[PDB]
Amino acid sequence: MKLVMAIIKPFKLDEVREALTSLGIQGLTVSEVKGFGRQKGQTEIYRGAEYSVSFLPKVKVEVAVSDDQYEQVVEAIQKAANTGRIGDGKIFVLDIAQAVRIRTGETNTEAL
Amino acid sequence: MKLVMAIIKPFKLDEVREALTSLGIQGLTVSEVKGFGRQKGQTEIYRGAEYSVSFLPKVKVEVAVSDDQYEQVVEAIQKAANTGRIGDGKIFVLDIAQAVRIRTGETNTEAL
Amino acid sequence: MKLVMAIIKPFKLDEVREALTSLGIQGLTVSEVKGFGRQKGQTEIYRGAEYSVSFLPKVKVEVAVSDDQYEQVVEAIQKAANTGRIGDGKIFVLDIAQAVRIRTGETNTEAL
Ligand SMILES: Nc1ncnc2c1ncn2[C@@H]1O[C@H](COP(=O)(O)OP(=O)(O)O)[C@@H](O)[C@H]1O
Numbered sequence A, B, C: 001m002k003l004v005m006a007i008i009k010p011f012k013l014d015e016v017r018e019a020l021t022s023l024g025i026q027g028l029t030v031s032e033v034k035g036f037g038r039q040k041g042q043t044e045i046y047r048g049a050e051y052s053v054s055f056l057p058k059v060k061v062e063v064a065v066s067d068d069q070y071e072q073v074v075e076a077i078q079k080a081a082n083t084g085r086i087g088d089g090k091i092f093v094l095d096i097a098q099a100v101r102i103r104t105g106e107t108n109t110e111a112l
């Protein structure tokens, strides 16, 4: 099991859920985040301090898939979230030790 | 050390913090998220595009516990977050390589 | 590769991004969260239920760095986020199995 964590542009999310659905992935969990990177917001200095005046929204997609699916999931998200412009974002893969589906108690692959 | 990540229904959170407190867990960190799964929101098509018009709020509980507590923490959250209805959510367990408490520099178990 | 996850006080974020920038870290991802711990919000009881009436905002910094940088990143964040008062927060380190930069397909260290 893996937790694929993808930090994408908020407008690429419909296309991302689509690819994932084309792969057979039942569901996912989404978070709103602010991004900092090469592409940065505007700053302002006021009284010896520099304050951020604009922010770069991103969407964090967090999806648990099996060891047989993650590599395909990574590739799918990469292709689905790509624009070719700076700020496209990241995909990180972390290892899931255990998984539980709260409704049924199902574990491992059956929890996803 | 483990990071227990639980994606639950937002109204089951008071009951979840309670169980965790009954286990001796000092604290936790909570995030607001949108869920997608079997239980889905409503959609709308407008001009060759399908837009989501309703969303399913979930709460993400993120709690670091020791290797001697995580299995009990998982079980507690599972029982505390269960309703028996579709959408109860997930619990994922990931491995924590290092931990630091910012205030005191305490590490490992003493950081939690 | 590691995902350094730091749960800090929201006003220590400018100082945190600064240290990270002094270390050569290109970017990071930030989330708004609620904290529960020793330092707690106010509660209220109404009709046989206890409701939370105040909340403790925290900022979650999530930054992927290489195996040669993480220990320095942890230390930097610890020093940059420290106040000496209760509620300073946590830093957790998790292992990243794979990394992809969506724009270019670059992997591993080149993805960060
Ligand atoms: N070290 C990092 N850890 C976690 N997320 C990052 C990191 N660097 C960048 N990001 C995320 O990637 C997004 C894009 O960063 P940017 O460098 O502007 O473009 P690109 O990813 O195309 O190089 C950022 O807004 C940020 O959310």
Ligand SMILES: Nc1ncnc2c1ncn2[C@@H]1O[C@H](COP(=O)(O)OP(=O)(O)O)[C@@H](O)[C@H]1O
Pocket: A025, A026, A027, A028, A029, A062, A063, A064, A065, A101, A102, A103, A112, B007, B034, B035, B036, B037, B038, B039, B040, B056, B058, B085, B086, B087, B088, B089, B090
């Ligand atoms: N593959 C997944 N990865 C991460 N979170 C998921 C995944 N599948 C479902 N979830 C989360 O679990 C919640 C419940 O999903 P759903 O399938 O509707 O009910 P159940 O979990 O009872 O089967 C979703 O709203 C979503 O937040």
Ligand SMILES: Nc1ncnc2c1ncn2[C@@H]1O[C@H](COP(=O)(O)OP(=O)(O)O)[C@@H](O)[C@H]1O
Pocket: B025, B026, B027, B028, B029, B062, B063, B064, B065, B101, B102, B103, B112, C007, C034, C035, C036, C037, C038, C039, C040, C056, C058, C085, C086, C087, C088, C089, C090
């Ligand atoms: N077990 C835990 N798992 C994840 N985050 C935690 C945990 N315990 C505390 N935190 C986070 O650390 C913050 C500070 O907790 P608190 O105990 O009040 O102060 P301190 O970290 O200085 O002991 C909390 O608001 C919470 O967000």
